[PDB]
């Protein structure tokens, strides 16, 4: 079946540098988008979404024309002390009444020092 894996538990980065938060899924099926969030609670912040919204400081590590891509690592540019926290890589299942959450990675601690 499929698992969403975040290998790095902690990572950090000086101000103005690029932090890499890596994520890899085992399989593409069930079909669904991969989203990155900061925090686990109800008021969590969407960090990256491929289809909609603009996330300027986020770049996809797997890069374009990566066919059948299963590497869902992200890169957050120009890091500030404000962007410190725990980031979760979550897999979603395609669903109407709005999509549904399926599996979430352990999480990667980001700091700033």
């Amino acid at each position: 079946e499929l698992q969403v894996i975040q290998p790095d538990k902690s990572v950090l980065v000086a101000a103005g540098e690029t932090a890499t938060l890596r994520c890899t899924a085992t399989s593409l099926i069930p079909v669904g988008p991969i989203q990155w969030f900061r925090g686990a609670g109800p008021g969590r912040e969407l960090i990256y979404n491929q289809k909609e919204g603009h996330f300027p400081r986020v770049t996809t590590v797997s890069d374009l024309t990566k066919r059948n891509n299963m590497d869902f690592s992200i890169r957050i540019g120009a890091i500030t002390p404000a962007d410190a926290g725990t980031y979760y890589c979550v897999k979603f299942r395609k669903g109407s009444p709005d999509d549904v959450e399926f599996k979430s990675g352990a999480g990667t601690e980001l700091s700033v020092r």
Partner: antibody
Amino acid sequence: DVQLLESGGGVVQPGGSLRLSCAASGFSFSNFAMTWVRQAPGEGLEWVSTIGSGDTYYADSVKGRFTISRDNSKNTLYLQMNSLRAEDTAVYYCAKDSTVSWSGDFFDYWGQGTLVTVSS
Amino acid sequence: EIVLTQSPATLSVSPGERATFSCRASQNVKNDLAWYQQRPGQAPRLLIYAARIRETGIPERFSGSGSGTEFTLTITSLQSEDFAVYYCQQYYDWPPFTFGGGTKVEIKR
């Protein structure tokens, strides 16, 4: 190389049933979604259904009548069609799904198609 | 739910010239567009996915461009093989996949 070979298509009455099979080869059938797309005579392509790994999706005109099934032990994709309507007459294509980057699911390889004829 | 409209539904071009046709969508802003080529007695084959990415084994003449609602497929030098029907497919928003009406590239005489 990737090959998709359909079978089980023929002529049946309205309201009859028919089962289509598409045996996949040349790629890891277990790690990809598979799709059926039909094309009526003298008209364009229309998407029917899509299966992933227990998640199934159906077209609006098809929701209640058709069920997509796959068996990884046979590397085959199935589409059993029940309560067949006369308009459902089309050439049924089995296709393999592929994703670019983080956006997902266009059709890279298409089967040669099996002809189904719903008529009295 | 996102319907694709293809204009020049039929397009008459001379061999060796250039043919350009457009696909238009409602409610999709991104590049999740695919182009397909189908010959009369044959199954469709993928030419371009993600608007501008040309599939392997496809000649350089075929080229896709555009984003948002307007998209276009271009062939530099029309050959005998290129005369077929061409469909656009979006995978941006789908519980239901959707195909374009199709543009048939036709020989002009």
